[PDB]
Amino acid sequence: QVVQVNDSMYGFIGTDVVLHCSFANPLPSVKITQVTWQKASNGSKQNMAIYNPTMGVSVLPPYEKRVEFLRPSFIDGTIRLSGLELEDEGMYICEFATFPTGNRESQLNLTVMA
Amino acid sequence: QVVQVNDSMYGFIGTDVVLHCSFANPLPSVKITQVTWQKASNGSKQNMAIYNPTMGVSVLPPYEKRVEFLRPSFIDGTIRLSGLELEDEGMYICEFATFPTGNRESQLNLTVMA
């Protein structure tokens, strides 16, 4: 019960897109430690962005000045990816690291239209 | 980028196996927030055990009597799994949630013999 396959997003070259990732339903007994956007491709994943309720926001290249958390909370890891291009197409994983229940990862496919 | 270790394991039925998992060297910039163990079986992830440096240890069913940390640290999530059943066959993933680097995981395939 780890993976939660979500929507499928369709964006456009040049325009930005809103990738969605929220946590529901939040319980007081469950504590969210981190939200982590990763891009999966060719069978290999890649760290994209991380929101930590205490450590702040981190964006990793090539996604700095591109990816921005809209409502950075522990139940919301929604991001905006700027300047879509053909290389951006692929599977995206938004993972919540929670204690003591474990990790919940949402999974969404992104297609880039021309 | 997120997968740094890929190994294999073997063991007889009823015997105990020590699944190793560690991180070195975490840069002084890098902070480990949580360590998580997962099992992948026929396209489905399942949370096993979690060690959070600031919250403690949690062993989830049905592993609450079989799986155990040996030296639980922010750089060591090595566990022992006792009473190996045939169903235990498969890939096990030990994940380090870090900031600002993100997720760094180790995958090991445990095969059951007799």
Q: What CATH number should be reported for the domain holding residue A73?
A: 2.60.40.10
For the record, the structure tokens of A93 come out as 């994983």
DSSP, collapsed to helix, strand or coil, labels residue B88 as helix
Residue in the block written with tokens 């939660």: A4
Number of structural domains (chain B) is 1
* Chain B contact present for A78, CB below 8 A: no
Calpha distance B95→B103 (Å, rounded) = 7
Side chain identity at residue A19, one-letter code: L
Its domain, for residue B39, covers 1-114
Structure obtained using: X-ray
Inter-chain contacts counted by CB atoms under 8 A, chains A and B: 84
Phi, psi of B5 (to 5 degrees): -135, 130
Residues 6-25 on B with a CB inside 8 Å of A are none
The shortest C-alpha distance from B47 to chain A (Å) reads: 6
End-to-end CA distance of chain A: 36
Question: What is the rounded distance in angstroms from the CA atom of residue A64 to the CA atom of residue A79?
Answer: 12
Query: Can you tell me the distance from the alpha carbon of A84 to that of B14, in angstroms, rounded to the nearest whole number?
Result: 53
What single string gives the DSSP state of each residue in A5-57? Answer: EEEEEEEETTS-EEE--B--S--TT-EEEEEEEEEEETTEEEEEEEEETTTEE
